[PDB]
Amino acid sequence: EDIKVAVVGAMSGPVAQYGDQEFTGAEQAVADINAKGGIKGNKLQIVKYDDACDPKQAVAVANKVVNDGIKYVIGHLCSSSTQPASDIYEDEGILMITPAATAPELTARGYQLILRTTGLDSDQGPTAAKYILEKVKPQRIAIVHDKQQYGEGLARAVQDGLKKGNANVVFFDGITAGEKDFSTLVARLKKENIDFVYYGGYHPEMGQILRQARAAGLKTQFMGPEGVANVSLSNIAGESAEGLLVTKPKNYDQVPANKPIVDAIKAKKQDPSGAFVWTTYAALQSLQAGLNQSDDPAEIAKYLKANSVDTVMGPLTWDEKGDLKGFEFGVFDWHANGTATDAK
């Protein structure tokens, strides 16, 4: 008796790279879980939904999953898409485990059916600020963001951290997502003699900013969050991407015990390097542990909050609001060839 589980993310649109990672991880996890007998004999069946990381489409998707009678959701991805959908799932009694939404508010509203297999920006932001203050020590900082929940949330947190540390933040400003011309911004960076920029947002904009800043001869050091640490960023910025600092989850694809999964994904000519491949795979393993205990969403959530689950990300333990305990974002140097190495 097949068990349907919705896998929701940006399958199309400007940030479709995130959905590619998610689906890659989900497909392999389901194949692996089914290969070993499924859940008590029952196989998992993935039902794909595209919310394009758009808040309006996310609501349309959430209502559809409810209508389709699906009780378990692996997603969504972007915070501004995941938040309005979580409202619906919680009211309808649907379990939702997000492998990528990082805005803190999602789990600060008393909801009982939401969990994450990624960290919090209340940790990612401070991690970036601390590194900037202790290791980089720039003279004239600018903080830029795309005016969307994720990016502006991180930008304000970093701003707060730098202010508390008495760093010199010259200006803070936002740009519009989808914009391709950043000549005004780069000119402001040049006029202001900015040596370091923290950008809160996704790869499409970051890529354009990097390529355009370098084209104008800026030697400015840039830093971004996990949303810009992926191959698409390198595709867009090319050479202009080397030297970029990013905060992101550990390289799970490099832990020895995960090699069989890496090989399986490479054999299908898919890319196993993206962080969301692993947070999504771990989300399915978490759901699996829960389903072995009960098919009721509320019972699964209770079980996961009371017991650890060993996954491709190592043992996961959740607190009462559905967040991972002890999760850490690391600081890495990003390279034009799409890889990341531990920062110094």
Ligand SMILES: CC(C)C[C@H](N)C(=O)O
């Ligand atoms: C896919 C990820 C870049 C999403 C991001 N962490 C957010 O909360 O919007």
